[PDB]
Amino acid sequence: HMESADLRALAKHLYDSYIKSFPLTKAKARAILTGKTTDKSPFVIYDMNSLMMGEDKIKFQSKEVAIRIFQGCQFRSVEAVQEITEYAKSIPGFVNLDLNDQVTLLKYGVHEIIYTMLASLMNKDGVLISEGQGFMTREFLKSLRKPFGDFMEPKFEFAVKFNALELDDSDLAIFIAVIILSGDRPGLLNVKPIEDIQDNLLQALELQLKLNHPESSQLFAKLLQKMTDLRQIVTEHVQLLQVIKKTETDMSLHPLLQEIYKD
Amino acid sequence: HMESADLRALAKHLYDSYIKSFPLTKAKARAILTGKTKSPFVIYDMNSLMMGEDKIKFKHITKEVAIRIFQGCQFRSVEAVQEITEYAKSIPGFVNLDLNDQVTLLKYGVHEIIYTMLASLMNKDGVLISEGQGFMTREFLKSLRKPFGDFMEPKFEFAVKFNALELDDSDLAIFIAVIILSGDRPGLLNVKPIEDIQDNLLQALELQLKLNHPESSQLFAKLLQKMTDLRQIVTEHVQLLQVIKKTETDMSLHPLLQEIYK
Numbered sequence: 001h002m003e004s005a006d007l008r009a010l011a012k013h014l015y016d017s018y019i020k021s022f023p024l025t026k027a028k029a030r031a032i033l034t035g036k037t038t039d040k041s042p043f044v045i046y047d048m049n050s051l052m053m054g055e056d057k058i059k060f061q062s063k064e065v066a067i068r069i070f071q072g073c074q075f076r077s078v079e080a081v082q083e084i085t086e087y088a089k090s091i092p093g094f095v096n097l098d099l100n101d102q103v104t105l106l107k108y109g110v111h112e113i114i115y116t117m118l119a120s121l122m123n124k125d126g127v128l129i130s131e132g133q134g135f136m137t138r139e140f141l142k143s144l145r146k147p148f149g150d151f152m153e154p155k156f157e158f159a160v161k162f163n164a165l166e167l168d169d170s171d172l173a174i175f176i177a178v179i180i181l182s183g184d185r186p187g188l189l190n191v192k193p194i195e196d197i198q199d200n201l202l203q204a205l206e207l208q209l210k211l212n213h214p215e216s217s218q219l220f221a222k223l224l225q226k227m228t229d230l231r232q233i234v235t236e237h238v239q240l241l242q243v244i245k246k247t248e249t250d251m252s253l254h255p256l257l258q259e260i261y262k263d
Numbered sequence: 264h265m266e267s268a269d270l271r272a273l274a275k276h277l278y279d280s281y282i283k284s285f286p287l288t289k290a291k292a293r294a295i296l297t298g299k300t301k302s303p304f305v306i307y308d309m310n311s312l313m314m315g316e317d318k319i320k321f322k323h324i325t326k327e328v329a330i331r332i333f334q335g336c337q338f339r340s341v342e343a344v345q346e347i348t349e350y351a352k353s354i355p356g357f358v359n360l361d362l363n364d365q366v367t368l369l370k371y372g373v374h375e376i377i378y379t380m381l382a383s384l385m386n387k388d389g390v391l392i393s394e395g396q397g398f399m400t401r402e403f404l405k406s407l408r409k410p411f412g413d414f415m416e417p418k419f420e421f422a423v424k425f426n427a428l429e430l431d432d433s434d435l436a437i438f439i440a441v442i443i444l445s446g447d448r449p450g451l452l453n454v455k456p457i458e459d460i461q462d463n464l465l466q467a468l469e470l471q472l473k474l475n476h477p478e479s480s481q482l483f484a485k486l487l488q489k490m491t492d493l494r495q496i497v498t499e500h501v502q503l504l505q506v507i508k509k510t511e512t513d514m515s516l517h518p519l520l521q522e523i524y525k
């Protein structure tokens with residue numbers, strides 16, 4: 001059991017590290033998506049030809065479109081893993097855990113966090129890309145051939161519901177921390193020190209939601225139930241990769257991604 | 264939103280109804296499992312199974328053995344569905360929902376509640392059966408052949424973790440109510456009143472856990488995280504039925520029975 005002032009300090013700590021670790025925050029993404037700004041407008045990719053023009057205009061070749069798009073998501077997921085890893089090191093207590101557990105927490109936690117933060121870059125019509133310089137429409141992603149057409153749509157379905165909770169970055173900073181420090185991951189050696197940290201983070205999240213959304217009844221509980229939707233999306237994604245590996249033997253995963261997905 | 268006195272009234276209402284709807288409560292099952300009490304008849308191998316049917320006359324095992332046991336779980340699950348249906352009618356607001364939504368909430372909720380309540384009858388060594396008169400060991404279940412051996416064990420693994428929260432019946436009565444009122448079930452026509460009721464139940468559950476477990480920090484959050492463990496087991500269970508349907512044709516019964524068990 002922690003004191004209110006210590007919980008507020010923990011929330012401020014975590015929000016501060018989240019800003020230092022993730023260059024594209026939800027606040028910035030919403031300013032780009034909402035508009036009313038001439039300096040932040042993204043180039044919109046909605047079909048084959050505008051994708052062609054996008055590489056001319058956005059920048060960061062002998063491949064097929066759905067593959068190039070898919071490989072673009074792998075590259076960005078690797079960057080996201082790197083940012084999530086840097087953030088986790090700042091969670092008080094995380095780096096003091098057993099080394100194998102640290103790896104285990106990251107292995108199972110990064111994807112649930114990736115889809116969480118991807119919701120920030122999404123609205124019902126598409127997703128920001130290339131650090132907010134681009135915007136790729138949902139419809140164009142859904143029209144890609146083979147198994148790649150269905151790849152992004154579950155993420156869009158989650159994002160629409162998750163975004164209806166109206167969380168801001170300071171909420172997400174604590175929520176992401178709660179996800180990483182899950183004591184129910186398979187193969188953890190010392191569940192107890194992980195659960196003590198998560199108990200602190202849950203208290204910080206509870207107080208944060210009460211203060212920042214005082215008129216949003218049971219938001220804490222509603223937010224925890226969204227961790228169920230994350231688990232199912234991760235499973236759905238993993239099964240899709242298995243289909244791609246057995247069909248596209250031309251294609252290859254980044255070693256970091258390769259390791260996360262083993263088991 | 265709601266006043267503390269009304270949350271305690273809501274909690275008391277659900278407890279009373281839960282006692283009337285479920286004959287074998289967690290308190291009673293724990294008395295039987297611990298030895299804090301007619302000792303229940305133990306099924307631990309093939310031979311004690313034969314004697315159990317002869318002496319107790321189980322209605323779910325009245326064909327090959329692993330199949331009979333599988334079919335026995337289906338019979339009991341169908342009974343549990345009716346008990347859960349009657350309980351849901353007492354949840355304030357439920358019967359005033361659109362009739363199709365009531366059916367949708369029960370349809371998708373009963374499996375999660377069956378597993379939740381199955382944990383009340385389980386310990387790490389086996390499961391109570393036949394309204395507490397029998398006890399089937401975990402080891403005997405794990406030793407059933409073909410896919411039936413691996414059918415039973417996920418339930419025990421969940422039950423062991425879930426039981427470590429040490430909930431009692433007055434906690435579970437509200438938790439069960441919260442599961443039923445999930446506004447994210449597919450095909451719901453009017454989500455708003457469902458989520459309105461769930462907010463009241465969640466408030467009642469939160470206050471219940473702080474009063475009944477004041478030393479158990481963030482138990483509310485931890486119990487909500489178990490709804491992830493439930494959803495994953497239900498999905499896993501469904502996939503196992505598909506595997507039995509596609510391989511075990513020794514399983515088809517009387518067509519009338521098949522309709523009862525659909």
Ligand SMILES: N#Cc1ccc2c(-c3ccc(C(=O)O)cc3OCc3ccccc3)nn(C(=O)c3c(Cl)cccc3C(F)(F)F)c2c1
Pocket residue numbers: 323332333335336337338339340343374377378380381384390391392393399404414415416418500
């Ligand atoms: N190992 C394993 C195992 C232990 C128990 C069950 C039960 C059960 C659920 C509630 C109750 C209760 O008293 O409230 C008692 C139960 O068992 C009693 C019993 C009877 C005979 C033999 C062994 C046990 N259901 N079930 C299922 O398989 C199942 C589930 Cl969880 C969900 C949906 C459908 C099914 C089903 F269709 F397939 F049956 C169990 C598996």
